[PDB]
Amino acid sequence: GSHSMRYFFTSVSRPGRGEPRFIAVGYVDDTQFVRFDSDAASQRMEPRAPWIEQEGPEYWDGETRKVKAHSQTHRVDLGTLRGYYNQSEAGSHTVQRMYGCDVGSDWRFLRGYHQYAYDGKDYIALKEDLRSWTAADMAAQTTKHKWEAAHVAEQLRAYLEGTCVEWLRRYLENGKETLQRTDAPKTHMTHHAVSDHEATLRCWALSFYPAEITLTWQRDGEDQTTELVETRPAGDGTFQKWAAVVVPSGQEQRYTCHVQHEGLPKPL
């Protein structure tokens, strides 16, 4: 199976509220395993999974120091980016950064990422090649020239191909029964009349671990191309989703729901 490790950092300015809010979460696949919150009591990188708690004191001092260094940097970035766009000091603004790496079935490096946003819009991103930056506007081109000078891409490329992949392999081994599991979706269908001549068929998929799932309708033979909600967390590690069709009554028997998920041998 394909696997990934991602880090998500959000920094938000709080004019008049004092220091800006910093939140960081670390995922392996769809499983959160670490977090930091500037508002939380500890001021430490906290564990959010069982298999990570077996890592030693040196690991936790290291991650905390690194995340504190990320926050201190963002605390600057917020101010720098206001200057570039000439914005007011009294307004709240949002900086977001996501990085991580991708490993194939064979656990070898597949891809790397490092993206950066300002007020929910693309700012600057590392390309596919991991040697180069895409700058979204004139402001980010300033940052491009600064980061080309400071050799950022070259030192990120070392992390993404090396440290990122080797610790992802280590996490996959530590938390094997949690991360290398595949919970197949528990499925059923519900019926409600909505009219004299119409009725809703809802197709449920629940308690499935990997969020990658496809719910599709068919009538007789061809895919029924209709309501579909975003995949949602159950809150216990597994995920949920439903899909519905409004169908003429007395003709519910000619509709079928199709479920594709890596936990299922073949589609249901």
């Binding site: 690991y59 991650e63 940097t73 720098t80 980016l81 940052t143 600064k146 980061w147 990120l156 990122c164």
Partner: peptide, 9 residues
């Protein structure tokens, strides 16, 4: 294991 490589901007 986070990254050590974080440059201001």
């Amino acid at each position: 294991h986070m990254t050590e490589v974080v440059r201001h901007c």
